Amino acid sequence: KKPPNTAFRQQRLKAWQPILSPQSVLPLLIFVACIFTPIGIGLIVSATKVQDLTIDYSHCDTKASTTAFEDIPKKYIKYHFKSKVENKPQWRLTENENGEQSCELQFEIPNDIKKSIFIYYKITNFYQNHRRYVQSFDTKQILGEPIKKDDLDTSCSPIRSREDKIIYPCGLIANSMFNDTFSQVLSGIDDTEDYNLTNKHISWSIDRHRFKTTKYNASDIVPPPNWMKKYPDGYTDENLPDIHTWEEFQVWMRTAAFPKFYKLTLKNESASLPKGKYQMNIELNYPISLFGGTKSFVLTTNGAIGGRNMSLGVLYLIVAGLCALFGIIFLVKLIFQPR
Amino acid sequence: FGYSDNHISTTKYNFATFLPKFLFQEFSKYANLFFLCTSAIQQVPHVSPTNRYTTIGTLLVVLIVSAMKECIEDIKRANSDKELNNSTAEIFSEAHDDFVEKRWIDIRVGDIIRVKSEEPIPADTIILSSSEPEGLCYIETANLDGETNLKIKQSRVETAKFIDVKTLKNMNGKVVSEQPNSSLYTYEGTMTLNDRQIPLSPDQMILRGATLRNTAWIFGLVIFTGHETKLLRNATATPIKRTAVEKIINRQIIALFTVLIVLILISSIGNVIMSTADAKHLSYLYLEGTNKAGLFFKDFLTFWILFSNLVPISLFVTVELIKYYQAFMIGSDLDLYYEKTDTPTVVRTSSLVEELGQIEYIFSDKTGTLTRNIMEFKSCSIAGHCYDGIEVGYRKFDDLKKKLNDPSDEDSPIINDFLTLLATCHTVIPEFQSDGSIKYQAASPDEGALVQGGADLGYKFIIRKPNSVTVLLEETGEEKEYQLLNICEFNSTRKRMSAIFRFPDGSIKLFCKGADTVILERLDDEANQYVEATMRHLEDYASEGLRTLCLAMRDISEGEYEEWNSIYNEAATTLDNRAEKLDEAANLIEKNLILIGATAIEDKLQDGVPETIHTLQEAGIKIWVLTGDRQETAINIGMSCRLLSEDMNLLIINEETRDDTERNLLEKINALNEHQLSTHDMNTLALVIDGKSLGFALEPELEDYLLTVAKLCKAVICCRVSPLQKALVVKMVKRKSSSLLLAIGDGANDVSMIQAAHVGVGISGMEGMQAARSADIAVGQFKFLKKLLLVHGSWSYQRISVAILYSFYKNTALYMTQFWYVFANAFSGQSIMESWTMSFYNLFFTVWPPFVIGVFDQFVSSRLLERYPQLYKLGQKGQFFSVYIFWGWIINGFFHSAIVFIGTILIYRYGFALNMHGELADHWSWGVTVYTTSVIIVLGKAALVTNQWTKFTLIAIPGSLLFWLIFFPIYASIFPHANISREYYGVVKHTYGSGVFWLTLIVLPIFALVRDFLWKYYKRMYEPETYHVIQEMVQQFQNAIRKVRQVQRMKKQRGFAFSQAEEGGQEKIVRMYDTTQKRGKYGELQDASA
Ligand SMILES: *[C@@H]1O[C@H](CO)[C@@H](O[C@@H]2O[C@H](CO)[C@@H](O)[C@H](O)[C@H]2NC(C)=O)[C@H](O)[C@H]1NC(C)=O
Ligand SMILES: *[C@@H]1O[C@H](CO)[C@@H](O)[C@H](O)[C@H]1NC(C)=O
Ligand SMILES: *[C@@H]1O[C@H](CO)[C@@H](O)[C@H](O)[C@H]1NC(C)=O
């Protein structure tokens, strides 16, 4: 029969067609530049507000000082404080048969940084975003379930089983983890602060709900082969790790996206860090030669972006530059074209 | 015993041909083979970077939705096949004797049916009985063949005595019939009655597609039925017709598969270089497998899965929904609706809709498609007077007024004999209706136009008696009684007919009508008195496309008709050759005539046909006419519908057995060796081929030779073409020098011609109906092809062009970050986003913006797209959709994915881009950041490539952004707890709780939208050459082409046409009928009055 004469069916819909006059496009470009300039200023200023300190301590054992406080070379130190650092950071390498080449790092904070300070370890050239790497953890097994043989996740394949036993934290991530134990104290030298730090509230809040203490009895399981030095005899009911409590395991299990990443260890969100000289004692357990890059620790005090990253700050100014560079091209062209 | 039913199933699939024809129809496109195989090899263990069942899932959704559109399409044509199949049919029953109103489906072979008049015939039937003397009946085969005349279908003498419905119980026997082959004019059979053998012929062979006219009823023994019939045999399958836009889509899938294998080679060779160079620095992977070619193959498959989504999965489905929904919105238009017979312009295949913007050649039928099959008495050149604006009826009041000037008027016996000639010299049959009107049963619509035009001018024709009186009725007088003495039948080698009469005062006179080239060689007219003015009025008739006859008379004495009637009596009783000896007699009698005058009737075209053909030739489309009717008829129709203009040369080609290369070589040697400007030489040159001259000229020694230099004509009018050679013309043009073709026809002489085309249009409405149901688009009337083609194809091609190129853009704008991350993962094959979120990209959140680009936008209004038919040539050249512009869109996706990638690299550096208590944005928070940023660049680009904004574009362009921003905490907050996407634990808190996630979504799309916003400003404020350049856009060769054999000028055309066949009935009909005596006791029984 006859089709309806509605505006929908007869293709007479109420359509708005925007004409791109320079009375509309050009105030749009001047407005977008005019709104992305002050925000981008506010995002470089809030990214140059944070005050980090990165010390590449990867070549602390092969460079060994081991007797005095000698300077760190300028390839390794990166500081971005508000004040200038008068005394350069020092480094040494103690060895007392139980410390096993701990690297005392002795830096000089030049101002009392009042925002919450966060200590990371930066690892360069560790491909934690590898395809075989972001798999290789049994999700039911980090939940605490006694997952037996042939029920384990097959993505754990090289680090899945051992001498007629199974590895409880199987796979590549739960092997191969960064084990340079940072000291819980920024030890202030010459009686400055003796500043404390916590390895609690370090991971995500949902990792602390998923990573649970396991239900094995330590005779069905075996530790993964890379951290077999902390467990030389193996797994016993006394020394068995609480995955729910350890919380530096599960910042490593939260694999980052890039070869060059931070991972959180320490923080203190309740007090300011004064302008003392601080000795941070790092027990060097994790070799360079495992991966192929630099291990460094970062002492940072993040902001609204969350770090000294001027990228999105200058990236509002590339867009706010082009909306003003072409808002003058398409206005001087707009005047001189009918001239 | 296993004969067919009577259903014409034009379904694309029936029951078991669904799955091979649909899976072959889906896997003929390369972007479903590619995901069948990247679905299959994704099942290889430890290879899939996404999931086992991602591409399985979304390929399955694509397959189900495309099967849903295929299913609804085939149901919407299945109830139309059933609509044709529930038509009425009266069938004799063995239990009780009456014919009962059954359907067409319930007809089998050997079933005596009864069909009424001016209503169609369901099957190929032998006429056993009829209501007419000696059981004859008429039929109009304007859908079998194309001729507009009517055909004698005589029934046999031994079987025509079964007039009664009650008495055909003892009619027992068999019919040893012909094989069901498709020779239309040929039938062989031997019916066996109760005692005797009866020889059969195509005389008693009413076929399916034609209608019974000018009778009361027939009795038909059904022989062939359904697809067993002669006309629908090799003509109904609904084939898969690959549109020309999806072919160049397929070469764009070859193009993206080329850049795919470039990325998998760059990527996997990078995996070899990094996996063997830094093997001491990748010891935290445990790559102890030293098979480097094996892991080259496995990792080759990982990048073959992770890059596999560069070709879009929702490509052919969203194009099927744009094509289906455009086909819905053009099958529901008031401007394409024909309100006289209530046909709402339905589009059936729904996937050949962007073909309508591609059409270069249209291959039309003449009969029914261009004409209304009505002939009206237009004008009459009568004693050398037509008129002195156009007035014609004022001559008719000057004719009834000039006749009553009988004391002082020289023309009054001449116009008296002309008006007597209009209503006496014919073979029409008068039918006394119940009302106050008379209906003329005419085997020629020419003769019906002449008799009805004489009846509208005084002399109303009243009663025929067989070898007896022939009476009329004057308006001034009462009744005059004539006496038809002899009749001279019309013949194509004769081109005239005559009828010797006896006036009621005793004066034996001859009347004769025909062509001036045949009549005018045989007359005197007292030293060409009325002759030259008759000539110039014939030229005035043929210049307007009017069918024309020269109507003359002479006188016969009593002894001349005595001896001549004797000679014609021994000439009529000869069984050697009756037609040839009656022609030799019937031009021994036709000497020294007197040219009384001329007539002019028109074949009464469909509404808007010259305006449509004119506005299609302005669109760059070359309309050819593939007709089954005569040459002179189609030259007069092409003259009337403004195909043949004034001063057009008509390259006639009427070949013989091997006299082909004389006509072709003479016209092409005399055509190519001299060269004019050749733009205004196109417009004064046309081709007219026969059907015997085209079965000999469609063969590969003459085939490309015909087309590639005889496409230099403006109009090609292929005259008297069978339903086979029409399809041979269409296949011949779409194969050699492959353009995009359109076919339009009314009846089932065109059903092979419509299915063999790129898009086949059909005419719905009247008795020509079978072509419309087995069409791609069924249209009420030919004039709707102007708005259906120029508006609804230029929209349907440009919108589908921007939709396809946009979907290639959007898929290479998401999934190319996957390749830039190969440089940063380890050349390893790490997916950035979660598995199902990518499936959600190409299934839920970017699938509607191509749908609203492809439908609810317009780039040209419907006003200026039909006020300027020159804008249709933008689509024929393939300007909007090519592979070069495709590389513009793909490289645009590379640039946008590159700046989304690099931007989010520098923004989320180290993962350290959160304020939430020192926590770090991981792999997957960054993954939905580049996913969401790519969503906003992609629908931001869809905002930049829509011209107009409807309320459905505001649902799809920003409402897909809003639908993802609402969708993502629901999905990532519910489905991790159902162990489906366990990569999303905490990702809502670490993305939507992030300041620098929403900051990234604000600015990082506005970089890409700065590029396309400034370029989209520039290409419509300073680069306007898409529409506006098109809006702002000799005698020696003609003397050479006039010298060629069979070339006919326009100024010498006299417009003769007379639709009457040799088996149409002239001399048998007049000797049988009575109008005075009424019907018999059984039907409208007329006795054999002989
Ligand atoms: C800290 O981690 C490193 C490497 O991640 C451990 O070094 C490995 O120790 C095992 C067992 O002693 C050896 O078989 C490997 O060859 C060592 N890999 C190296 C040196 O690259 C180290 O033992 C860990 N220290 C602990 C747990 O205190
Ligand atoms: C604070 O620092 C001192 C100095 O090392 C340490 O002994 C003490 O346990 C710390 N307090 C804590 C960790 O609560
Ligand atoms: C932060 O450091 C101060 C010393 O400056 C210490 O007293 C306090 O306990 C520390 N807080 C935490 C949570 O470690």
Side-chain angles (χ1 to χ4, degrees), chain B residues 69-82:
Chain B
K69 182 258 183 179
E70 177 70 25
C71 184
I72 295 168
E73 170 181 351
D74 201 10
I75 291 168
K76 285 171 70 176
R77 74 179 68 249
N79 55 5
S80 296
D81 295 333
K82 187 174 87 273

Side-chain angles (χ1 to χ4, degrees), chain B residues 69 243 246 316 318-328 350-354 796 800 855:
Chain B
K69 182 258 183 179
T243 177
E246 81 182 5
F316 186 62
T318 186
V319 168
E320 277 184 350
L321 294 176
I322 293 163
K323 289 185 296 185
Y324 182 79
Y325 187 78
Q326 283 173 354
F328 176 75
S350 295
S351 67
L352 285 308
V353 183
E354 73 275 20
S796 175
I800 200 64
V855 177

Side-chain angles (χ1 to χ4, degrees), chain A residues 51 81-83 108-114 272-276:
Chain A
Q51 309 190 11
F81 298 99
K82 186 184 288 184
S83 296
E108 193 271 331
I109 306 297
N111 52 0
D112 47 355
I113 49 179
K114 295 180 181 179
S272 177
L273 178 61
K275 55 178 293 295

Side-chain angles (χ1 to χ4, degrees), chain A residues 8-11 16-17 120 127 129-132 154 203-204 257-258 269 290 303 305-306 308-309 311 316, chain B residues 46-47 283-285 325 332-334 821 824-825 830 906-909 912-913 915 918-919 947 949 999:
Chain A
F8 168 72
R9 188 69 70 87
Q10 300 299 315
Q11 291 176 351
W16 294 270
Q17 185 177 1
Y120 294 88
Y127 301 103
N129 54 358
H130 188 80
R131 199 277 301 259
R132 300 179 70 253
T154 183
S203 181
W204 287 3
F258 307 121
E269 296 177 354
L290 192 277
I305 307 102
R308 188 178 174 89
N309 197 0
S311 164
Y316 287 32
Chain B
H46 298 285
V47 172
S283 63
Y284 58 94
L285 277 39
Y325 187 78
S332 189
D333 193 4
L334 263 296
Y821 187 61
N825 54 15
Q830 183 58 248
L906 299 173
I907 289 163
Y908 285 1
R909 188 178 65 193
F912 183 54
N915 201 4
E919 295 177 354
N947 195 1
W949 287 91
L999 269 54

Side-chain angles (χ1 to χ4, degrees), chain B residues 37 50 60-61 77 113 126 191 324 352 371 405 419 457 464 578 611 644 667 720 789 870 899 917 921 969 1020 1038 1076:
Chain B
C37 62
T50 307
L60 187 65
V61 172
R77 74 179 68 249
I113 64 167
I126 304 300
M191 184 180 288
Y324 182 79
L352 285 308
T371 64
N405 202 0
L419 268 298
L457 292 178
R464 175 170 289 174
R578 187 179 65 191
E611 183 179 1
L644 305 177
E667 288 177 353
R720 196 174 61 240
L789 199 63
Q870 296 293 111
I899 199 64
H917 297 285
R1020 68 182 292 166
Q1038 290 180 355
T1076 300

Side-chain angles (χ1 to χ4, degrees), chain B residues 916-967:
Chain B
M916 50 197 78
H917 297 285
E919 295 177 354
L920 295 173
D922 59 350
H923 183 194
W924 307 105
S925 297
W926 175 68
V928 297
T929 306
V930 320
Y931 181 84
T932 318
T933 306
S934 176
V935 168
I936 305 171
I937 69 177
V938 150
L939 58 87
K941 176 65 169 174
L944 266 300
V945 302
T946 55
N947 195 1
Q948 69 180 2
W949 287 91
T950 60
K951 292 183 176 68
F952 294 100
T953 63
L954 292 174
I955 292 170
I957 309 302
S960 295
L961 188 151
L962 268 296
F963 180 58
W964 198 79
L965 268 60
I966 296 299
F967 185 81

Side-chain angles (χ1 to χ4, degrees), chain A residues 6-250:
Chain A
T6 63
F8 168 72
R9 188 69 70 87
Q10 300 299 315
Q11 291 176 351
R12 291 182 291 111
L13 285 82
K14 187 180 263 77
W16 294 270
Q17 185 177 1
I19 186 66
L20 297 184
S21 178
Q23 298 298 110
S24 68
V25 170
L26 273 294
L28 191 276
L29 295 174
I30 298 299
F31 180 74
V32 167
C34 188
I35 200 166
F36 289 167
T37 42
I39 304 174
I41 295 299
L43 291 166
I44 291 173
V45 167
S46 63
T48 60
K49 188 65 69 177
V50 305
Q51 309 190 11
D52 56 354
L53 179 143
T54 302
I55 295 172
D56 193 1
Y57 63 93
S58 63
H59 296 90
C60 183
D61 55 353
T62 62
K63 198 174 260 75
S65 178
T66 201
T67 186
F69 291 153
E70 71 180 4
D71 291 331
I72 304 172
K74 292 182 182 180
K75 296 186 289 184
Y76 296 154
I77 49 96
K78 282 93 172 65
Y79 60 93
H80 295 283
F81 298 99
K82 186 184 288 184
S83 296
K84 64 181 181 180
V85 172
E86 296 293 327
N87 291 318
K88 295 179 182 179
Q90 280 76 234
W91 70 275
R92 71 179 295 165
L93 185 69
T94 191
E95 186 176 1
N96 53 2
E97 197 267 331
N98 291 318
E100 291 293 327
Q101 289 180 356
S102 179
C103 182
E104 285 93 1
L105 291 167
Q106 186 175 0
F107 52 90
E108 193 271 331
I109 306 297
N111 52 0
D112 47 355
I113 49 179
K114 295 180 181 179
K115 198 175 263 78
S116 298
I117 67 101
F118 298 95
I119 287 181
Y120 294 88
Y121 54 90
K122 179 175 77 177
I123 299 175
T124 303
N125 202 4
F126 193 92
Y127 301 103
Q128 201 171 10
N129 54 358
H130 188 80
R131 199 277 301 259
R132 300 179 70 253
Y133 207 85
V134 313
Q135 60 184 0
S136 298
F137 66 99
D138 196 358
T139 307
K140 299 293 179 68
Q141 195 174 10
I142 53 95
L143 287 168
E145 297 178 355
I147 301 298
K148 298 296 290 183
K149 190 181 288 293
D150 294 331
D151 292 330
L152 295 174
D153 196 0
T154 183
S155 65
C156 289
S157 178
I159 313 166
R160 188 176 182 271
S161 66
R162 284 178 70 187
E163 54 271 13
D164 202 0
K165 290 183 184 293
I166 56 174
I167 296 168
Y168 160 67
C170 69
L172 278 304
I173 317 163
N175 209 12
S176 74
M177 66 174 288
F178 188 80
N179 56 3
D180 292 336
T181 60
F182 290 176
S183 69
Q184 303 294 110
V185 183
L186 293 176
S187 298
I189 62 100
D190 293 331
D191 196 2
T192 58
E193 179 63 27
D194 197 2
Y195 186 80
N196 267 320
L197 295 160
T198 56
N199 56 2
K200 302 286 103 176
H201 298 283
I202 291 298
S203 181
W204 287 3
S205 299
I206 298 96
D207 293 331
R208 292 176 288 171
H209 289 88
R210 291 187 294 115
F211 291 95
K212 298 180 177 68
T213 62
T214 192
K215 290 174 71 69
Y216 291 105
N217 54 3
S219 66
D220 294 331
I221 51 173
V222 70
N226 216 8
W227 48 280
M228 195 69 204
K229 185 177 183 291
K230 186 171 71 176
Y231 294 103
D233 189 74
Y235 275 158
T236 315
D237 291 330
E238 181 68 28
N239 60 1
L240 184 143
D242 292 332
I243 298 298
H244 187 273
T245 311
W246 187 250
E247 195 168 0
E248 293 177 351
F249 174 72
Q250 65 194 1

